[PDB]
Write a protein that binds this ligand. Sequence first.
Ligand SMILES: OC[C@H]1O[C@H](O[C@H]2[C@H](O)[C@@H](O)[C@H](OCCCCCCC3CCCCC3)O[C@@H]2CO)[C@H](O)[C@@H](O)[C@@H]1O
Ligand SMILES: *C(=O)/C(=C/N[C@@H](C(=O)O)C(C)(C)S(=O)O)CO
Length: 265
Amino acid sequence: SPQPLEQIKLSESQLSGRVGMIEMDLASGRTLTAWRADERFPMMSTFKVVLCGAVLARVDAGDEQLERKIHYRQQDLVDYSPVSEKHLADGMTVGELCAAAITMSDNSAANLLLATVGGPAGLTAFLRQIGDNVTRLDRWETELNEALPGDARDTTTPASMAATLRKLLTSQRLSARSQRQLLQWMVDDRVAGPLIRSVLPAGWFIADKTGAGERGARGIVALLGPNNKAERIVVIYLRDTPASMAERNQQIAGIGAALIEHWQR
Ligand SMILES: OC[C@H]1O[C@H](O[C@H]2[C@H](O)[C@@H](O)[C@H](OCCCCCCC3CCCCC3)O[C@@H]2CO)[C@H](O)[C@@H](O)[C@@H]1O
Ligand SMILES: *C(=O)/C(=C/N[C@@H](C(=O)O)C(C)(C)S(=O)O)CO
């Protein structure tokens, strides 16, 4: 593999799209690799990790319980609700909804949670409260995936997303138990976690959330490291590429391969 930066460049040339990337030490926030780190990219389903950080903040403050059962209706459901469509009669707890949103990318679960935190405006206010002045949510599922060229709605930057994830997971803004819960939901991702593990060398830790949108938009927010440790945050977004899903996946995997091959930096 090329050095990570050279692989990122190759991925842009091959995709004919924009890649944005950060590699950050989880414990310290040291930025190791940065490429278009201050440019905007649609979050797509990666926003669901920040969403559940806001939920956990409410739990910590005594304004929410993960146990609280939310009753909902069929008319509430949006496209792609593999878990929530199964519980129209009996409802789902707030914690189950976060598990469905993060681990299954259940869109109706995400909207139900968004309703508990004040909608897109409320989630954006939470981001501002934790010192992220860049990331913004404007719309609900599934419109937030539209990825119109040049449109700032529903975007983050690799640098802001990585800093925000670090804040949520490690900064004691969230309680110890809440930090552990957010981490566990990422460890439990069913959409990409097992596939990623199938191609990682033995000994490498993965936790993640992935996203996809229009016009080739694709992303992953992840924790990765050797010796079975979540050593680094890696955030990679792609946008404005005509490439197949398979090739977008392969290019992201190639960046990961370069990071692994050149880990000591
Ligand atoms: O010397 C380092 C390693 O080199 C290879 O590992 C390969 C592996 O066989 C391949 O499957 C992977 O592809 C990359 C898979 C990455 C999966 C997605 C990663 C995510 C994680 C972070 C967010 C962005 C991408 O590359 C590594 C590095 O060459 C050898 O197989 C392995 O025995 C050896 O320990
Ligand atoms: C998370 O990124 C999600 C993406 N969904 C899209 C996809 O390509 O899978 C759509 C088809 C645009 S849709 O939102 O289902 C789930 O919100």
